[PDB]
């Protein structure tokens, strides 16, 4: 149908989006330290304490499967590599303030954003 069609197109519109704002939050993270997936040969306890591990790689991969519907969904998985990493790491950890760096920085990125799938109606 015409109407599944229309559908398909704004999601592929809310794709191209956020693959910019994933580029984005990423480039705030020089170190690359959320760019892939903690390792569990460096943490191997690392399942035994966070239940829903999260990075930028596998943000990408379900990104480019058009499996974020809305920006929410998107949030809660930068959300996640950033609360996951604050619980684990200690304040004075370079892994801890990376994640507040982040953070703080993403949020600025984040807050555009909700406003142009606003506008647009990408949702
Ligand atoms: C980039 N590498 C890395 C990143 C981590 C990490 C450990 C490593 N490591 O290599 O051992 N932990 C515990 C963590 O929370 N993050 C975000």
Not at 92 to 101: E, K, L, P
Request: glycine fraction near 4%; charge should be negative; hydrophobic fraction near 40%.
């Amino acid at each position: 149908s015409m109407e599944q069609v229309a559908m398909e197109l704004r999601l592929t519109e809310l794709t191209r989006l956020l693959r910019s704002v994933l580029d984005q939050l990423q480039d705030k993270d020089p170190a690359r330290i959320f760019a892939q997936p903690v390792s569990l040969k460096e943490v191997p306890d690392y399942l035994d304490h966070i239940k829903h591990p999260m990075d930028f790689a596998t943000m990408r991969k379900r990104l480019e499967a058009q499996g974020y519907k809305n920006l929410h969904e998107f949030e809660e998985d930068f959300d996640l590599i950033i609360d996951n990493c604050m619980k684990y790491n200690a304040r004075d950890t370079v892994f801890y303030r990376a994640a507040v760096r982040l953070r703080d920085q993403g949020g600025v990125v984040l807050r555009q954003a909700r406003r142009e799938v606003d506008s647009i109606g990408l949702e």
